[PDB]
Design a protein around this ligand. Structure first.
Ligand SMILES: [Cl-]
Ligand SMILES: [Cl-]
Ligand SMILES: [Cl-]
Ligand SMILES: [Cl-]
Ligand SMILES: [Cl-]
Ligand code: NA
Ligand code: NA
Ligand code: NA
Ligand code: NA
Lengths: 288, 290
């Protein structure tokens, strides 16, 4: 049957995270899970499901994508996303977005409306205007929390995977990237086979230290272990997270064509949720 | 078995009737650039320096779609991209959106060496280039008469690389391109994406060429390495499986070397401008199938 997983990012989420900051993030996870489950039960194809959920996770200011993107070194927002359809292996990606309200929707339009997969920076902003997507002033995306985070860094990702009852799979990832990143830095989120992958067998969205995820080709590696060694989703995701990538760098979510779900992480925490047709659902931050 | 090097000047529908005056300089360029890599490997230059030196020269040859001679965007502009990977460390570097940088591959290497990042693109990459003091020239330098005409033909109708291994099994890959003629401004292809156009690990080094979007979707360079690592396929078995089973005909060619000094250069296109050499005394320059 159908299955959905989502994340609001992996990293060093401290156990002492105050309730005032925990609660809104938990509420956001549970609300996005309800949106994605409602969508699958309304017979929306998995590509529409992961777009719809990641649009919400972009709009949530407590998550690093869309509004609440982390700031470049220059105190600016540069947003990036990718989307992949497992059944066609069609895909779309964008980098260097500064005014586009929903980066993941622009990635979808590159896939549908152009002969290309990947547009970035000024050409991606020009395509956004040609398509008439929603834009706001760059100041919309910058939060007080992210101004402070950049100050402290100089001193010192969201995702959705879904499968319907017919084995159709999709993956969507969106980010502001890494605090204090150099202007023009591209991380793992928009790279097919790093942050995002979907094929006949699985759909994967990765989150964490961008450069490690690129070097590790994490999303492709999950799919490759299932295809080339006959590993189950759980075996393939476990091996990548706990065997092949360094501690404190990576988490991912994955669903299979058979409707299984895996959300392993090697970080302290990962803001995560999932639901299956088989009546499993969970919302979590830390290990249980 | 000792050192080995392979290089390409791109794969695609190179017609069997390609007249001598387009074939000639490209075959000579392959032989010239192979000499650069052979002399470097005979001098025991690290593979990462070998592939950078060869691809710099391939960028400079105006008949190849990289550096000077890069194909034109829809707007008649050059937007250049490159990636480089060290198989021993899996250290890598990538650049997209370069308009004035003479050698894209060398800025990919500086990202890897001088920053905490793998990949810089467009204004931020051009600004890193200026901080680093690398050679830049006016955007008009990169535009050739041949590519003005190619773009005119594309609107009407509507890659280079090097892999090297030393006798100690150290592996490197480098790939540089103008991209696709009449591409939208800001379009990124496979060349700068680690695991699509470029990959190196302890077992192999891979550079891919052909239709960017097919190579992204097929994660070609990573797939060769994954079949060797996860199925125990030879370099040849893995390379041939990717090109002749896992990807559409007419889209892709690749060059690859193994830790053991094996060479493979399969393609599913009409042709692929290619050359290789091994310490065992083999060398080859070719365009079409034998
Ligand atoms: Cl990142
Ligand atoms: Cl010519
Ligand atoms: Cl020089
Ligand atoms: Cl390309
Ligand atoms: Cl051959
Ligand atoms: Na957000
Ligand atoms: Na497309
Ligand atoms: Na050139
Ligand atoms: Na680096």
């Amino acid at each position: 049957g159908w299955a959905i997983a989502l994340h609001g990012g992996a990293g060093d989420i401290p156990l002492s995270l105050p309730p005032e900051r925990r609660h809104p993030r938990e509420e956001a996870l549970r609300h996005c899970l309800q949106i994605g489950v409602e969508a699958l039960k309304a017979k929306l194809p998995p590509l529409d499901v992961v777009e719809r959920v990641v649009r919400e996770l972009e709009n949530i200011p407590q998550f690093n994508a869309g509004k609440g993107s982390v700031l470049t070194s220059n105190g600016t927002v540069e947003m990036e996303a990718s989307i992949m359809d497992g059944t066609t292996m069609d895909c779309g990606a964008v980098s260097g977005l500064t005014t586009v309200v929903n980066a993941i929707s622009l990635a979808r339009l590159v896939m549908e409306k152009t002969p290309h997969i990947y547009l970035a920076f000024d050409g991606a902003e020009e395509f956004a205007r040609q398509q008439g997507v929603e834009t706001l002033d760059s100041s919309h995306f910058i939060t007080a929390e992210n101004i402070e985070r950049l100050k402290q860094a100089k001193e010192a990702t969201v995702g959705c995977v879904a499968v319907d009852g017919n084995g159709n799979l999709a993956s969507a990832t969106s980010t502001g990237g890494l605090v204090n990143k150099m202007v023009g830095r591209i991380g793992d989120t928009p790279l097919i086979g790093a942050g995002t992958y979907a094929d006949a067998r699985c759909a994967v969205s990765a989150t964490g230290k961008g450069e490690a995820i690129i070097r590790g080709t994490v999303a492709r590696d999950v799919a490759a272990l299932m295809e080339f060694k006959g590993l189950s989703l759980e075996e393939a995701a476990t091996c990548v997270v706990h065997e092949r990538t360094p501690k404190g760098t990576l988490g991912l979510i994955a669903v299979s064509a058979k409707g299984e779900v895996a959300m392993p992480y090697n970080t302290t925490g990962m803001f995560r949720a999932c639901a299956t047709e088989d009546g499993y659902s969970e919302v979590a931050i830390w290990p249980s």
